[PDB]
Design a protein around this ligand. Structure first.
Ligand SMILES: O=C(O)C1=C[C@@H](O)[C@@H](O)[C@H](O)C1
Length: 114
């Protein structure tokens, strides 16, 4: 089943975050070398997932953070009709997540001429 479909059923956001954690757990040990992975946007707000990322980049890593302007990243997600009414504002999510991304990141890259 799909990700938005998981959000609707008994799973919700509760089970979805542990669905990520178990895949990340499995990927880190099994697919340990020779891959490049795009993680979820909110992987970083599961406490146990942060421990895995931090533990990974403390002994070799690497874990790359990509962060465009905080205005332009917002308008990409605001321009997306799939978004429940009364759900979290993107400003407050990005600002709460920012310190966790840094903590969980080994490397950093932003385009010098965006
Ligand atoms: O902003 C987020 O927390 C998410 C971003 C997407 O990559 C998906 O992981 C999901 O829609 C949640």
């Amino acid at each position: 089943m799909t990700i938005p479909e998981i959000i609707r059923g008994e799973r919700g956001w509760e089970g979805f975050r542990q669905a990520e954690l178990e895949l990340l757990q499995d990927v880190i040990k099994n697919q340990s070398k020779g891959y490049i992975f795009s993680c979820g946007g909110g992987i970083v707000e599961t406490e146990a997932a942060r421990k895995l990322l931090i533990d990974y980049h403390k002994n070799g890593g690497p874990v790359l953070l990509v962060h465009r302007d905080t205005d332009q990243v917002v308008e990409y997600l605001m321009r997306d009709k799939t978004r429940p009414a009364y759900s979290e504002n993107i400003r407050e999510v990005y600002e709460r997540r920012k310190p966790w991304f840094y903590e969980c990141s080994n490397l950093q890259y932003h385009s010098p001429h965006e």
